Amino acid sequence: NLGLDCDEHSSESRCCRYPLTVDFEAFGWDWIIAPKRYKANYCSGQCEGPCCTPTKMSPINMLYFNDKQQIIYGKIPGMVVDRCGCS
Amino acid sequence: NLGLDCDEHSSESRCCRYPLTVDFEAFGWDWIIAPKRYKANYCSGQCEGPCCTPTKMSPINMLYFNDKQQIIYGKIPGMVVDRCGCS
């Protein structure tokens, strides 16, 4: 398979990956220590039914408080869109 | 500029980003606690300088020992190839 990577304001119409930064403190996800922000990206474009959606995801390593007075470092899956495709 | 994202054995001749897993444990980089391996990717393909090279990079968050008996969590830049292009 083949994926496409675009900038914002590109003229590509096909299903493409675009940049997007997620900001945990902006949503009040207070229990996260780091990172406070990260580039998650997102998918958009014509698939002409099938739609443009993540076909590959990658993890990020996070430092956060849990429910049990612990601080966790852990690899959290499914956090970054690595590729977009029609499905 | 538009980037392409390939699987291994894709048959694409153009400049494209391919998957690649870096394994710190395999190279004995013993000051790194986590992650022991991660998806860095790489760039390969024809550009008809111009050479197929990374054009966007992403960090990873790492846990490691330093020179001063300390354990460090930090955002390490330039660790993941996010986009490949001809330049």
Author numbering:
A (entry chain B), B (entry chain A): 1 to 48, 71 to 109
Give passages from the manuscript.
Growth/differentiation factors 8 and 11 (GDF8/myostatin and GDF11/BMP11, respectively) are two closely related members of the activin/inhibin subclass that share ~90% sequence identity in their mature, C-terminal signaling domains and ~52% identity in their N-terminal prodomains. Similar to other TGFβ ligands, GDF8 and GDF11 are disulfide-linked dimers that are initially synthesized as precursors, which are cleaved by furin-like proteases to separate the N-terminal prodomain from the C-terminal mature domain. The ligand dimer elicits signal transduction by symmetrically binding two type II and two type I transmembrane serine/threonine kinase receptors. Similar to other ligands in the activin/inhibin subclass, GDF8 and GDF11 predominantly signal through the type II receptors, activin receptor kinase IIA (ActRIIA; ACVR2A) and ActRIIB (ACVR2B) and the type I receptors, activin-like receptor kinase 4 (ALK4; ACVR1B) and ALK5 (TβRI).
We resolved the structure of apo-GDF8 to 2.25 Å and the apo-GDF11 structure to 1.90 Å using X-ray crystallography, thus allowing a direct comparison to the recently published apo-GDF11 structure (middle). Our new apo-GDF11 structure, solved under similar crystallization conditions as apo-GDF8, adopted an exaggerated “open” conformation such that the fingers extend past the horizontal plane. This conformation shares a similar exaggerated “open” conformation to the crystal structure of GDF8 bound to a neutralizing antibody (bottom). However, the wrist region in our apo-GDF11 structure is also disordered and not resolved in the crystal structure, similar to apo-GDF8 (bottom). The previously published apo-GDF11 crystal structure adopts the classic “open” conformation with an ordered wrist helix that includes the additional interchain hydrogen bond between Q62A and the pre-helix loop observed in the FS288-bound GDF11 crystal structure. Interestingly and despite the high sequence identity, nearly identical crystallization conditions resulted in two distinct conformations. Although these conformations may be a result of the crystallization process, it supports the idea that GDF8 and GDF11 are flexible enough to be trapped in alternate states. Taken together, crystallization of both GDF8 and GDF11 in their apo states reveals intrinsic structural flexibility in these ligands.
